[PDB]
# Entry
Amino acid sequence: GHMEKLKEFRGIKEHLGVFREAVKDAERIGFAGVPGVCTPFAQLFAYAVRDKDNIFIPNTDFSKARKLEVTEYGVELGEISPGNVDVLVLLGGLSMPGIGSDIEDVKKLVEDALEEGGELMGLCYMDMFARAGWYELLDFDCVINADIDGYVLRG
Amino acid sequence: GHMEKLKEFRGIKEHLGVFREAVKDAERIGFAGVPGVCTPFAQLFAYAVRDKDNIFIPNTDFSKARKLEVTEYGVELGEISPGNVDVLVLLGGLSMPGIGSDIEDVKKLVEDALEEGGELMGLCYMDMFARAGWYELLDFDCVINADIDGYVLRG
# Structure
């Protein structure tokens, strides 16, 4: 349903910080997204909340979820771990045409992987979820959206 | 040395695209950055050039470099592989005080890990390298810099 702007942020430090604030009371976070494109975002935000027990769900396949574990290299994928979560974070790639996932497979994921009473979140770039119609199709509790722009310089 | 602005980009697809362009003639790419916060950027951009032979170097420790390999989950760390590279991409976290790495250590890494005649690149956010004085301290061939801003919304 209707999503109201809470606040703005700037830079990577604040991007991680508003996520930490959003999940402050959570024990177990699940990040669901498209392998390759979205996996790095799951690893980045899991790192920011590495105190929690975190998992990565590929596409909408909860049975293939793996632990997001801290190593000397950062966050890496660990063993299969289809435990439900008290915050489920959908990544923007899921909403992409062609395999993002269909809305009914997404709703089944929410039914299966999010514990009853848990929070549904989205983390995306360039307003992907709003643009896909997903604010009307899903009941997000919180969405964090970032925009990216930049420059290439040569020596 | 002096870095001249070449072009601007917007969004994730274009961010990946300018990187693909910058390394189009490369065969093996090394990404060096701080584990945890920078590893995901190495994985993201490696995915974007998954046709190449790519490695992740933790901090400035070449001997601990690992292959960046594509799996059904995205890019994951594989075996130790301290082979030099024809493009070395320093990640912005390396320039952060406190372990970002000392500049002598970074110069050593460029000498050990970058092939003679290879290209030295920077990939950072929020203009980290310029702000740390690294355009004066290092001779980058290309730097790709992105800024992030966004919003939090609630349901």
Remarks:
- Chain A touches chain B through 56 residues (CB under 8 Å).
- Chain A has five helices and eight strands.
- The helical segments of chain A are 11-22, 39-48, 103-113, 128-131, 134-137.
- The domain at 10-147 of chain A is CATH 3.40.50.2300 (Rossmann fold).
